[PDB]
Design a protein around this nucleic acid. Structure first.
Lengths: 167, 293, 156, 157, 52, 117
RNA sequence: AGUUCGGCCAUCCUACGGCGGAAACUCCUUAACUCGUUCCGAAUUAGGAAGAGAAGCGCCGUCAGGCCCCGCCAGUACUGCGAUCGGAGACGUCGUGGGAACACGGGGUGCCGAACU
RNA sequence: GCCUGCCCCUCGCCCGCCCCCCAAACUCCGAAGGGCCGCGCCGCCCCGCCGCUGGCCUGGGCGGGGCGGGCGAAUGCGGGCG
RNA sequence: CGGAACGGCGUCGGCCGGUCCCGACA
RNA sequence: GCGGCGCGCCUGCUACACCGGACCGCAGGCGUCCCACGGCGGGCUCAGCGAGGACGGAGACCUCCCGCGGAGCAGAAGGGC
């Protein structure tokens, strides 16, 4: 509809950098996420111990920040300049939330520092409309309506207008 | 890719629906059980709950007893009644919540005292004449022939924080004279080594909205118009908030009786339910529509 | 030990609903426990006789009873009027089936009953009921069984 | 029965109903109980404190003691050749009020009511004693629509 | 015989199935102390009072 | 009637005729006065224990029993259970419906008791 | 009509599609505070009032699924009691009592009670 | 089948729907059959007492005094205690 | 004559499917 | 006798719908472990499907959805949540 309420918004961007058993790289990956997003990233530990990627239970193998608001738009567009505004058509989920990933933090536009090595990151963007709080609120929590839920096709259209992305 | 639906017929057959108000998300039955439970040796003596529920538009404060098949509302005062007492805007603000609580407490105590005369509950428990951050416990000193009315705060699904507005209505009930047990930890002023009456006094007097109003107007007049359009439209001066609040507290104490306003009822008739023959007729039409492609 | 009989569907298992019209059933006269060895030997005899006299395609044979009760290898609990063996066959095999069932009866313990089935094939519907539904088209076919097209569910 | 623990053979007895697993309705804690009231005892599986024993399930008793959280109820348990008054304390979740004498309480009221009603009008007093069915009266039944019914033939085999 | 319950129900019903006796129903055993103290305080006044 | 069906194997029952009642009350009737078996040979004994119930004479007794009247319990209890001669009994094991003797004999109880009185 | 608190907890649920909203409710709009985010005002805490029914929310629909109710199933299956009943049995029968279930068909699809506008 | 090719087929896998026979240690249902408890004293008014309960002029117990009705399933049979 | 699965054109009693005066090629 | 232990204790059975029922009858446990694996309050949802996201694949990590519990609650089994 042309209802103001049915306007899609970028609810959240998640920047996750998963390294492994090297230990030092994880701390440095957090610092470049802190300087990119401007908020402090948190660390996700391992759920299982696997010898092949040295994964050990509770080894803090990941670092991620949830960026919301105007900051999220700036980071997504800078990442999409690395992708040259081209995304796969199937990179969109059934929920209407899409994602992309880049290698090399320098490609985003961050300046290089010798102490911290280049680390790539995954960019997952969640698309939402005003009125979706009915799923997340503590009191009177009910599922969003199927019409009000973002459809994968309607999400492609929104991003092909906002960032002129071609699929 | 080819997978069974999570919600199978078996899922629905074995599904146990939760309680109607739990499904709605309106009530926590674990909290309610403790708030409603009374000793069996006390039998049917009524147990009162001071329920403070905050809708976006107003703060609803009520005193309710738990009957076996219903809840009885002994008294209920709403923030929407505050314009009659001289508070036109910020009806969901912390200061308004305190005055809504004062209104329910005074309204109930007055209703108990309407005909008693000899030892009226309101006469025996007047309350704090001035709205202050000082901790007041009516139960601390009691007539001993009459005791302060006791009710227990019910916040529902609200998170208990220092400065939360649910506590402000409880302080107004306490200020009116209702004995509501409290610790004053979740009040603006508790700092471990003591209570700063000044900090609570300020929230009760609406200082936080009025300092913001003064700062916002200076920093950006246009945002002040957008943020506080109703205040500018109600001709409420920012500094005047404390005077308005003190006058309101006095106006509540002098006459807490409900105006008992009544309005029109507008009910849309909506669609009439289809008759069984009408449903059967739709089935014939649906079969005919599918038959020709 | 494993039951000697692992195959309970023999003959034309994939045959169509109207491919076979006449069904014959070998029921149990007495309540008894029938061995897996007894079900394997009766299953070899009946299948072989009809397949020899007619064709494997001409008949679908089902050993309805299954040996589950381990005996402290395994035995099948059977009751009076519980079908032990069943066969649906076309006219080409109608005559041979009754005599094959009588060659399977000498292997199974206790009294046994050979009956023609008024029901069409393995379907619940009787031959007359099957025909009436078939003319209407209400008799939707599923695999080898037959069912009513039903007035339940979403119309579209 | 080699092992005899407090909760043995309680697989079905102390298990909730098909769609009744969950937290007790608040009515159990809101029902007023008075001394001498008849109360049925039925265990609730969810609640494990104040639980009575599997014997007590299905028993009806009088409330000897009412206490802050559990009511003391006295049942009669036949131990060999003697019935013994077994006083047990049972939490609210496993004590339900019994209709029990509700029929007698209704009868006492109705008998008194139909006595006063008679004193006013319809003066002959009504019979206030239960009659155990009794034989049927003679009556008359029309056999104009009578249908002949006959034994049916065997068709099973 | 390791165990027999035969004849046990004939022996029980020979002179048995006996009621638990009166004064067991109205016993104050297991009644709340605070209620029992209140009963004694109330009883010790006017007609119910049995002191001189 | 529900209790009687539990004990059917041990008993035979039927509706009695007035002559069958008269013969039992007169030829085999004995009272229960002071827990003693006192023979009913006169209308005086019946008057003594049943005047309160208005059962003054033997005709009142064979009438109350037959009509199952208001004073049926008193009338029946006044009579010590009848002691009769040995029954013919075709078969004690089966019900009269199955061709034996136990259970409902209906009108045939009158014939069955006749020889026993 | 709607709100708050409830009662019993699906005839109240689940899916999907319509239909509304004066008031109310909600979504909503912001962080000066208060408070809150393994990170994030998403939730939450506060302060609002520029918008809006698009959702949540009521109302209707759907040969819908479930749930609810009544028939049929079926006096069937079982079983209480009596049998110098039949039968080699293991199973059945008769007399006298009780009495399902799954299918299947036909419908229905929350109400109650306090306060307030 | 073919520069290759997944260019297509065949069964699996996997969902959908039927379907044969089931279970002492399975149960959405659910008997017969058992168990426990009740079947006489009520209704109404008043008053007394309590370190016990309530915001109260509230309860809950335990008594006393009235005023109206009263014996309110069948059958048998005196029960109890040391 | 305790007795089984199986046999019996022993003697009776039924149940069902048929063909008989279109004599069950002349 | 040899061996085992219905030689103390516990769960589901056999056990015949109150309760009580034997078995060198059956499938199993216990003699420990934890100052947290305790108490309480607040917040939260679990296992997983599906569909998605540089390395990264069957597999970690981050995402939304729908999630009657299909997870977890020290150890047997049954209840319970």
């Amino acid at each position: 509809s042309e209802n103001p309420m049915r306007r899609i918004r970028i609810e959240k961007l998640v920047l996750n950098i998963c390294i492994g058993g090297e230990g030092d790289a994880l701390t440095k990956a957090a610092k470049v996420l802190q300087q990119l997003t401007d908020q402090e990233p948190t660390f996700s530990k391992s759920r299982l111990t696997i010898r092949g990627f040295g994964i050990r239970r509770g080894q803090k193998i990941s670092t991620h920040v949830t960026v919301r608001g105007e900051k999220a738009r700036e980071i997504i567009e800078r990442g999409l300049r690395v992708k040259n505004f081209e995304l796969p058509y199937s990179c969109f989920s059934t929920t209407g939330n899409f994602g992309f990933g880049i290698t090399e933090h320098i490609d985003l536009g961050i300046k290089y520092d010798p102490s911290m090595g280049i680390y790539g990151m995954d960019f997952y963007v969640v698309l939402s409309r005003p009125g979706f709080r009915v799923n997340k609120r503590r009191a009177q929590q009910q599922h969003v309506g199927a019409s009000h839920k973002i459809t994968p096709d309607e999400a492609r259209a929104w991003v092909e207008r906002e960032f002129e992305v071609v699929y | 890719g080819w997978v069974k639906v999570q919600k199978t017929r078996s899922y629905f057959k074995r599904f146990q629906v939760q309680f109607r108000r739990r499904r709605e998300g309106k009530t926590d039955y674990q909290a309610r059980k403790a708030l409603i439970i009374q000793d069996k040796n006390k039998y049917a003596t009524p147990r009162y709950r001071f329920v403070v529920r905050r809708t976006n538009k107003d703060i609803i404060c009520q005193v309710t007893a738990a009957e076996l098949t219903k809840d009885r509302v002994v008294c209920a005062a709403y923030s929407h009644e505050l314009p009659r007492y001289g508070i036109p805007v910020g009806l969901t603000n912390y200061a308004a919540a305190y005055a809504t609580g004062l209104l329910c407490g005074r309204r109930l105590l007055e209703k108990l005292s309407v005909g008693i005369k000899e030892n009226a509950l309101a006469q025996l428990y007047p309350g704090l004449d001035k709205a202050t951050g000082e901790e007041y416990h009516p139960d601390e000193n009691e007539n001993e022939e009459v005791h302060a009315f006791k009710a227990f705060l019910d916040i529902g699904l609200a998170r208990a924080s220092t400065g939360a507005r649910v506590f402000a209505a409880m302080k107004g009930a306490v200020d009116a004279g209702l004995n509501i047990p409290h610790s004053m930890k979740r009040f603006p002023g508790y700092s471990k080594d003591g209570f700063d009456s000044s900090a609570l006094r300020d929230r009760i007097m609406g200082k936080h909205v009025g300092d913001y109003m003064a700062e916002l107007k200076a920093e950006d007049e246009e945002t002040y118009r957008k943020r506080f359009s109703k205040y500018i439209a109600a001709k409420v001066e920012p500094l005047r908030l404390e005077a308005m609040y003190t006058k309101a507290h006095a106006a509540i104490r002098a006459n807490p009786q409900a105006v008992k306003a009544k309005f029109e009822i507008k009910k849309p008739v909506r669609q009439a339910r289809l008759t069984l023959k009408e449903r059967k007729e739709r089935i014939d039409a649906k079969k005919l529509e599918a038959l020709k492609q | 030990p494993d039951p000697k009989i692992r195959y309970f569907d023999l003959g034309n298992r994939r045959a169509k609903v109207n491919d076979f019209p006449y069904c014959f059933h070998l029921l149990s006269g007495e309540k008894e426990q029938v061995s897996s060895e007894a079900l394997e030997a009766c299953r070899i005899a009946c299948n072989k006789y009809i397949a020899k006299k007619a064709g494997k395609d001409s008949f679908h044979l089902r050993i309805r009873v299954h040996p589950f009760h381990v005996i402290r290898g395994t035995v099948a609990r059977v009751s009076i009027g519980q079908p032990l063996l069943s066969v649906r066959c076309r006219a080409s095999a109608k005559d041979y089936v009754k005599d094959a069932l009588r060659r399977a009866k000498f292997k199974i313990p206790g009294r046994q009953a050979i009956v023609e089935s008024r029901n069409w094939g393995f379907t619940e519907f009787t031959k007359e009921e099957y025909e009436d539904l078939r003319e209407r088209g209400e008799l939707q076919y599923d695999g080898n069984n037959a069912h009513r097209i039903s007035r339940k569910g979403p119309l579209n | 029965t080699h092992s005899q623990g407090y909760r043995c053979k309680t697989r079905y007895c102390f298990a909730r109903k098909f769609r009744r697993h969950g937290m007790a309705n608040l009515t159990t804690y809101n029902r007023v109980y008075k001394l001498g009231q008849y109360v049925n005892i039925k265990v609730n599986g969810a609640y494990h404190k104040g639980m009575p024993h599997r014997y007590y399930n299905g028993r009806t008793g009088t409330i000897f003691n009412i206490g802050p959280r559990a009511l003391g109820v006295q049942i009669q348990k036949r131990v060999r050749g003697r019935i013994m008054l077994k006083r047990i304390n049972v939490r609210l979740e496993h004590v339900h009020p019994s209709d029990c004498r509700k029929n007698h309480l209704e009868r006492v009221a109705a008998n008194d009511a139909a006595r006063r009603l008679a004193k006013e009008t319809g003066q002959p007093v009504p019979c206030l004693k239960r009659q155990n069915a009794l034989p049927r009266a003679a009556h008359v039944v029309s056999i104009a629509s009578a249908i002949d019914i006959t034994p049916l033939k065997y068709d099973g085999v | 015989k390791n165990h027999t319950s035969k004849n046990q129900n004939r022996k029980d019903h020979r002179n048995g199935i006996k009621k638990p006796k009166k004064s067991a129903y109205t016993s104050h055993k297991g009644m709340c102390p605070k209620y029992l103290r209140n009963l004694r305080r109330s009883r010790a006044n006017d007609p119910r009072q049995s002191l001189r | 009637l529900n209790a009687l069906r539990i004990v059917d194997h041990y008993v035979t029952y039927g509706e009695p005729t007035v002559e069958t009642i008269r013969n039992l009350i007169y030829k085999r009737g004995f009272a229960k006065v002071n827990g003693q078996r006192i023979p009913i040979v006169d209308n005086n004994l019946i008057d003594e224990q049943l005047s309160k119930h208005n059962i003054l004479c033997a005709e009142d007794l064979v009438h109350e029993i037959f009509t199952c009247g208001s004073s049926f319990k008193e009338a029946n209890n006044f009579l010590w259970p009848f002691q009769l001669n040995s029954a013919a009994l075709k078969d004690k094991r089966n019900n009269f419906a199955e061709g034996g003797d136990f259970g409902y004999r209906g009108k045939y109880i009158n014939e069955f008791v006749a020889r026993m009185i």
